CSV table of C-alpha atoms in Angstrom, one decimal:
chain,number,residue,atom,x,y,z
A,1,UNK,CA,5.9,7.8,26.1
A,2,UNK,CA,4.1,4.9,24.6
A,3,UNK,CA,6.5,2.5,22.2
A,4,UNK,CA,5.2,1.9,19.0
A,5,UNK,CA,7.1,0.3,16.2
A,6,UNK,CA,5.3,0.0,12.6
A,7,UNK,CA,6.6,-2.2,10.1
A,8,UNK,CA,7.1,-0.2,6.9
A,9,UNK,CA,6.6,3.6,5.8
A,10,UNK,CA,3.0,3.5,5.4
A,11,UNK,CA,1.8,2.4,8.5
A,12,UNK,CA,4.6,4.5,10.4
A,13,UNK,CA,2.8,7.5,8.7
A,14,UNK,CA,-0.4,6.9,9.3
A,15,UNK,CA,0.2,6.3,12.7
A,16,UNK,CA,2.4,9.6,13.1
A,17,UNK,CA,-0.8,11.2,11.5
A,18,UNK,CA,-2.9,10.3,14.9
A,19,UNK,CA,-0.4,9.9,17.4
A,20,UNK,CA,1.3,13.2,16.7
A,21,UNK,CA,4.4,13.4,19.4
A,22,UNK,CA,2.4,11.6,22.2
A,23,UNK,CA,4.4,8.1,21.4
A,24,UNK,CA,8.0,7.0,20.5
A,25,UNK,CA,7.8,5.6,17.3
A,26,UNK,CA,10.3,3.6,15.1
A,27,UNK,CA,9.7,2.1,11.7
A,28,UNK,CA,11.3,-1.0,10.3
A,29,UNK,CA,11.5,-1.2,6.4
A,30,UNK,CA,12.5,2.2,5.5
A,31,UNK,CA,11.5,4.6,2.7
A,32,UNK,CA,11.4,3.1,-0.9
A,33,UNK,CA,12.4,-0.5,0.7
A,34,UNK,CA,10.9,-4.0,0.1
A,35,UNK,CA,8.1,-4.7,3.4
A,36,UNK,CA,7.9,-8.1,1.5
A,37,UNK,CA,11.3,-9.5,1.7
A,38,UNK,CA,13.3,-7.8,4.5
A,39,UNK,CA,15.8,-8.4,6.6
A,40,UNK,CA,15.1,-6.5,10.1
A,41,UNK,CA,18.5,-5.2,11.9
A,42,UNK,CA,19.9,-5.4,15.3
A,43,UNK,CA,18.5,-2.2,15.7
A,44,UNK,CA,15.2,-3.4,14.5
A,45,UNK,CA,15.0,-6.5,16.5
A,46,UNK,CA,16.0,-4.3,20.2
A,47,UNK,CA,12.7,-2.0,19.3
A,48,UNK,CA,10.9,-4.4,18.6
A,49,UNK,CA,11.2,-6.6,21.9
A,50,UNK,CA,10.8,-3.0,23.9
A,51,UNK,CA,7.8,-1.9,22.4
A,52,UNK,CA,4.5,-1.5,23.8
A,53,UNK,CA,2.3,-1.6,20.4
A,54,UNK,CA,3.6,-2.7,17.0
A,55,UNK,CA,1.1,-2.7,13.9
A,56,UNK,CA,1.7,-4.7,10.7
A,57,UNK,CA,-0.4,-4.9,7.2
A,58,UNK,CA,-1.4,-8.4,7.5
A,59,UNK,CA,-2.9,-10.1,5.1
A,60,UNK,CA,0.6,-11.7,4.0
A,61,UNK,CA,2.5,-9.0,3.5
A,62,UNK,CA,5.6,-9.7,5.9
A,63,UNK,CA,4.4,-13.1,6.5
A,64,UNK,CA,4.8,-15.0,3.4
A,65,UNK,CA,7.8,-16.2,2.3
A,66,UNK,CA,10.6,-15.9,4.5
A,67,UNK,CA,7.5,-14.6,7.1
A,68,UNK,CA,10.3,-12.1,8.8
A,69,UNK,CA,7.6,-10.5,11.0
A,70,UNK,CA,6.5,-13.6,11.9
A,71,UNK,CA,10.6,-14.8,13.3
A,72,UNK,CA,10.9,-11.0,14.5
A,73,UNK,CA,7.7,-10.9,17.0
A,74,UNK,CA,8.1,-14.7,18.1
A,75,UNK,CA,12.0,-13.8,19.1
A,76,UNK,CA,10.6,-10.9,20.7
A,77,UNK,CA,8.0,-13.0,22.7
A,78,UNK,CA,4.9,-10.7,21.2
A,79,UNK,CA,1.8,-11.8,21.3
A,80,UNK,CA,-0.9,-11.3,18.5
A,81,UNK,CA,-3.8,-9.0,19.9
A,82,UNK,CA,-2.1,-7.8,23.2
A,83,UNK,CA,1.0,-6.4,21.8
A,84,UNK,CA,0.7,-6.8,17.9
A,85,UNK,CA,-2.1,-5.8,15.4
A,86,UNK,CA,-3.5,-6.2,12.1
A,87,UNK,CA,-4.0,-2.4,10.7
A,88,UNK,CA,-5.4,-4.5,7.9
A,89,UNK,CA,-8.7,-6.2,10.3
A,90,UNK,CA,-11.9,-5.3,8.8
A,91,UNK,CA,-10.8,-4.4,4.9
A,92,UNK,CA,-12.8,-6.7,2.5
A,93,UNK,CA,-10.4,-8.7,1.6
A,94,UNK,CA,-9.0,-9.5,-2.1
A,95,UNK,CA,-7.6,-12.9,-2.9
A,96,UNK,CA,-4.9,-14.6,-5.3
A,97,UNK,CA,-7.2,-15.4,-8.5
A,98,UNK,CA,-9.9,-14.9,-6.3
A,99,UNK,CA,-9.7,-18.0,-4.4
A,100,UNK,CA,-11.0,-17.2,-0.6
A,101,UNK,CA,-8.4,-19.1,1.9
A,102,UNK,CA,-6.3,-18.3,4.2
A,103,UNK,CA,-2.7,-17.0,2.7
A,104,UNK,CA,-4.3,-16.4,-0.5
A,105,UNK,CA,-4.8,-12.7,1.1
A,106,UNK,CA,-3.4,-9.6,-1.6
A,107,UNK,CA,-1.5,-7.4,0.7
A,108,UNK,CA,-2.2,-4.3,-0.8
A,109,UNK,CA,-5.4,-2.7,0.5
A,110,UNK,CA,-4.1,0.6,1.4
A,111,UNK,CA,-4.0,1.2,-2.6
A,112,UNK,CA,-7.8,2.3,-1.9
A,113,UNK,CA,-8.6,5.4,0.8
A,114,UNK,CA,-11.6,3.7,2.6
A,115,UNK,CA,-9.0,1.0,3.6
A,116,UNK,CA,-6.7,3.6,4.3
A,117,UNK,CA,-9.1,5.0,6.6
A,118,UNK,CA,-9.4,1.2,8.3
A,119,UNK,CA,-5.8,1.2,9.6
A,120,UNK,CA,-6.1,4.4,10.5
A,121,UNK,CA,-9.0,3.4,12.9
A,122,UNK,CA,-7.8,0.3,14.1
A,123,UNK,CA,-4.4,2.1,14.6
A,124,UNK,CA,-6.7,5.2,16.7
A,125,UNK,CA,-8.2,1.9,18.8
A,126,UNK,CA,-4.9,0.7,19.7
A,127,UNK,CA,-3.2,3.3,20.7
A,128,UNK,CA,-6.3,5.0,23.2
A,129,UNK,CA,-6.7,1.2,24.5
A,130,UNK,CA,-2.8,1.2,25.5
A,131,UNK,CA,-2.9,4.7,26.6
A,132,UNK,CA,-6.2,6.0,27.8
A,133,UNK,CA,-5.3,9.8,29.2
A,134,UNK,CA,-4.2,10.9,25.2
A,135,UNK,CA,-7.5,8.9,24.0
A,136,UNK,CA,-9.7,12.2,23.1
A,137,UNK,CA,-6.6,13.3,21.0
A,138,UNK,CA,-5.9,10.2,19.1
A,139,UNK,CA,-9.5,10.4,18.5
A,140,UNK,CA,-9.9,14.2,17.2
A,141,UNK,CA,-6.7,13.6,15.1
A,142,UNK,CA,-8.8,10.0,13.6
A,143,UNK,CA,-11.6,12.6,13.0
A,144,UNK,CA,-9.7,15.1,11.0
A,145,UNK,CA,-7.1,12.5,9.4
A,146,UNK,CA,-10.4,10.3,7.9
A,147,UNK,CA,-11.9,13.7,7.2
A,148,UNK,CA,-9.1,14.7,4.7
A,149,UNK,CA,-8.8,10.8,3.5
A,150,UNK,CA,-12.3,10.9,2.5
A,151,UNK,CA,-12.5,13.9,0.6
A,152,UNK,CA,-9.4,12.9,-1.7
A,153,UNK,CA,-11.6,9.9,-2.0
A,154,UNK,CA,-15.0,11.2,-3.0
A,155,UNK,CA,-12.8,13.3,-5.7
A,156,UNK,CA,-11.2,11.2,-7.0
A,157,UNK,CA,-14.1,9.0,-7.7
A,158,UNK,CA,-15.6,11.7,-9.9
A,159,UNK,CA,-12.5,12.2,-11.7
A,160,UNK,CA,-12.5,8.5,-12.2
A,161,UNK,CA,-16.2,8.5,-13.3
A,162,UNK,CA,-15.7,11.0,-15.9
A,163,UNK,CA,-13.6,9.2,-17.8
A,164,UNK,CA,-15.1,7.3,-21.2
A,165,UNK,CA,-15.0,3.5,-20.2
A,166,UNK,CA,-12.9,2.4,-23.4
A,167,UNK,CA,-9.9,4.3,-21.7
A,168,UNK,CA,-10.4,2.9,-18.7
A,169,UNK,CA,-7.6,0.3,-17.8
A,170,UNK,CA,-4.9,0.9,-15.3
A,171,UNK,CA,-1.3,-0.8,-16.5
A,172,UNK,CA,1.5,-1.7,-14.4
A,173,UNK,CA,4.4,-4.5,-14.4
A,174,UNK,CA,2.8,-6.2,-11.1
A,175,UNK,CA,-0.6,-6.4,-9.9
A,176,UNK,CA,-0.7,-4.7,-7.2
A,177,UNK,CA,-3.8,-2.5,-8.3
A,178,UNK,CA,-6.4,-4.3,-7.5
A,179,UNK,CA,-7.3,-2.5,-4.4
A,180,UNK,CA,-7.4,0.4,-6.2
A,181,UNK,CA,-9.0,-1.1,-9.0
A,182,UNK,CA,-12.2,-2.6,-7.4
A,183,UNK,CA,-12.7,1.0,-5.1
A,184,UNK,CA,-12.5,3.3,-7.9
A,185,UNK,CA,-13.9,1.2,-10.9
A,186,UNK,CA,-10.7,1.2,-13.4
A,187,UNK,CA,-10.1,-2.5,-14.5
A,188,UNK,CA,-6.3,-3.5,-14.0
A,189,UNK,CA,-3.6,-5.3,-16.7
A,190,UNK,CA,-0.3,-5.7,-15.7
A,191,UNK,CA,2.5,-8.0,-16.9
A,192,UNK,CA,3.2,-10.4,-14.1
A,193,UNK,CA,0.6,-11.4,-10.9
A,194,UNK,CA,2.0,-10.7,-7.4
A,195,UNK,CA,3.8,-13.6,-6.4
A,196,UNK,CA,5.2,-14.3,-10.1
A,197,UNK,CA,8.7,-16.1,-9.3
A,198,UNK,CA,10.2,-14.8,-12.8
A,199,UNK,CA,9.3,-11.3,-13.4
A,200,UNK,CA,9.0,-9.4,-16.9
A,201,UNK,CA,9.7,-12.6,-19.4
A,202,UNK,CA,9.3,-12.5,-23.0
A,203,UNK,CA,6.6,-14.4,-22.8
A,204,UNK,CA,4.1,-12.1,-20.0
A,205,UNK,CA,5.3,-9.0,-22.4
A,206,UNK,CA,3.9,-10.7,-25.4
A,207,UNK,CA,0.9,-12.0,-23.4
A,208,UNK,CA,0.3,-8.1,-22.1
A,209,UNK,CA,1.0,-6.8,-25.7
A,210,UNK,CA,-1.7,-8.3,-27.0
A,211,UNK,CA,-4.3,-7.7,-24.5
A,212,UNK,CA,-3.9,-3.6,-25.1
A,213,UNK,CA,-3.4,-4.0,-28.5
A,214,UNK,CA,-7.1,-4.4,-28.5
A,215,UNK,CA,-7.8,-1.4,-26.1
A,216,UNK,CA,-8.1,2.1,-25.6
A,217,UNK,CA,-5.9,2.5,-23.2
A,218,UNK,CA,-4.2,5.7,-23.4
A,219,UNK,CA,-1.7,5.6,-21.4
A,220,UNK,CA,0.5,3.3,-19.1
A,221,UNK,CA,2.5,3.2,-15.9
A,222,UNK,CA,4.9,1.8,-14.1
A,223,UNK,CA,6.4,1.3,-10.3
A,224,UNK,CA,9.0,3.7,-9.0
A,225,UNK,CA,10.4,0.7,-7.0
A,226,UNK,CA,10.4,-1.9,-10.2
A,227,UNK,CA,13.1,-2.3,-12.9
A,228,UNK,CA,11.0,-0.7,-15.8
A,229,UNK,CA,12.7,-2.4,-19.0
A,230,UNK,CA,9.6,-4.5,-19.4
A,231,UNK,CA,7.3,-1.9,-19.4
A,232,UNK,CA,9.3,0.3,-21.4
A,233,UNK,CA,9.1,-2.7,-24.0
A,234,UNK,CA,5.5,-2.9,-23.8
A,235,UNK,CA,5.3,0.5,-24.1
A,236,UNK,CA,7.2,0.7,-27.2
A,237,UNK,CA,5.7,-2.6,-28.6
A,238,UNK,CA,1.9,-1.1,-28.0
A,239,UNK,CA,2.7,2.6,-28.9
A,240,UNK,CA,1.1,3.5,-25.6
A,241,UNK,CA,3.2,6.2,-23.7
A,242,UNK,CA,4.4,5.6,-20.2
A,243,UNK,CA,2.4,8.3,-18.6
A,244,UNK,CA,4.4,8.6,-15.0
A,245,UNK,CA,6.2,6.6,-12.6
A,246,UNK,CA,3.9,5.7,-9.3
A,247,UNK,CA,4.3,5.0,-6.0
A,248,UNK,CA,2.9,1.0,-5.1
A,249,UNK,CA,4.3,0.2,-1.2
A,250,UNK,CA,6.1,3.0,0.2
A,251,UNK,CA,6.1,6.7,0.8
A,252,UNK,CA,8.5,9.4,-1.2
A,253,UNK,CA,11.9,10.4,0.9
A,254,UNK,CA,10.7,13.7,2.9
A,255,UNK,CA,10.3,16.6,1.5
A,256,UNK,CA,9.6,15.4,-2.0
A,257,UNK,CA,6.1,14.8,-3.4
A,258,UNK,CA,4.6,12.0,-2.3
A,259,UNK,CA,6.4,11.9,1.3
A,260,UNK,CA,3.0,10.9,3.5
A,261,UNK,CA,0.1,8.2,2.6
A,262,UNK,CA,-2.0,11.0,1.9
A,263,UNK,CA,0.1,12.5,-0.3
A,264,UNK,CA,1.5,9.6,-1.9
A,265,UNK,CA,-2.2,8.4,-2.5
A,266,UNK,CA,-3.0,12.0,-4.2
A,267,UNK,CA,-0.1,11.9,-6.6
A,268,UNK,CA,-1.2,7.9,-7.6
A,269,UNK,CA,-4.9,9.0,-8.2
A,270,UNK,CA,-4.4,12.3,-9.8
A,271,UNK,CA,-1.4,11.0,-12.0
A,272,UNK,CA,-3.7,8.2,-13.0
A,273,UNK,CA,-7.1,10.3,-13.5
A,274,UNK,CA,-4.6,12.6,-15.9
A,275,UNK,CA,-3.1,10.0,-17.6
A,276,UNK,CA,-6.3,8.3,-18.5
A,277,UNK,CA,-8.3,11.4,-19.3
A,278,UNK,CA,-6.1,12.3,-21.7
């Protein structure tokens, strides 16, 4: 079987999604674990130099900083298009106060489905190109996977464009919406910009306070995988409930709600459509 390793729970999922069991697959950040900062294992690092196809996000996600995927597939003497790949190539790209250069990239473009449905193509075109004789399956299970993707999509762009534009504002601690924000037209506000170094000050909750003070907003949320103290003060300062905890970078543990991208992207969008309609 063909060796694929994926670096974090999304990717890994999509990827079992149109592989099915035709490959060997291993993923390295686990369930509910940071894919920004991340310390790969011994375990991690063997897989890694065996495989035959690894796919990565891109677009800075395990590059900046401490760039461990970058250490990781230049100790396992990988090279970039032949045995690694970008599920992230083709997305139109958000960037850092939208400043266009190179490592001002926002990582997290699989918070929108049509981007969704991009890795899950490049990840289709990678596997048939490695192996050919399972290429009509990959392809059926593309087919069927984008078919599903796309439907949640279309819905939940109505649902979105129900909603009366005063109430439309989705509230986190990071900002790590604004895939989701520029696909399915609901302005984000959060307390601290991706890349912040000190994270839920006095100072960003006062600053966020303020803003939705002069809003509609009717409800806020915050990140399962974020210590959510200051949004529990800004919820308290504003009024404005905390409507649910959402997913931002990782699957749920299986068996619970939220345990594919699929699903994990149907709770986000239908917690957030409820939440706002209300």
């Amino acid at each position: 079987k063909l060796k694929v390793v994926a670096t974090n729970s999304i990717i890994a999922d999509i990827t079992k999604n149109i592989a099915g069991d035709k490959i060997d697959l291993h993923s390295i950040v686990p369930i509910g674990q940071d894919p920004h900062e991340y310390e790969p294992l011994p375990e991690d690092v063997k897989k890694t130099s065996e495989a035959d196809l690894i796919f990565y996000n891109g677009i800075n996600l395990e590059t900046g900083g401490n760039a461990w995927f970058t250490k990781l597939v230049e100790n396992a003497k990988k090279t970039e298009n032949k045995d690694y790949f970008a599920v992230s190539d083709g997305v139109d790209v958000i960037y850092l106060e939208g400043q266009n250069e190179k490592g001002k990239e926002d990582p997290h473009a699989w918070l929108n489905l049509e981007n969704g449905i991009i890795f899950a193509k490049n990840i289709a075109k990678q596997l048939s190109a490695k192996d050919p004789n399972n290429k009509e399956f990959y392809e059926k299970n593309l087919k069927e996977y984008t078919d599903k993707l796309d439907k949640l999509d279309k819905e939940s762009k109505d649902k979105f464009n129900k909603i009366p534009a005063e109430k439309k504002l989705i509230v986190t601690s990071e900002g790590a919406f604004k895939y989701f924000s520029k696909a399915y037209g609901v302005p984000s506000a959060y307390i601290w910009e991706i890349n912040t170094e000190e994270e839920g000050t006095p100072e960003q909750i006062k600053t966020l306070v303020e803003k939705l003070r002069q809003t509609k907003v009717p409800s806020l949320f915050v990140e399962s995988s974020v210590d959510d103290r200051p949004m529990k003060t800004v919820s308290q300062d504003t009024n404005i409930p905390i409507y649910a905890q959402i997913f931002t970078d990782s699957i749920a543990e299986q068996g619970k709600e939220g345990d594919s991208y699929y699903s994990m992207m149907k709770y986000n969008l239908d917690k957030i459509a409820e939440g706002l309609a209300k």
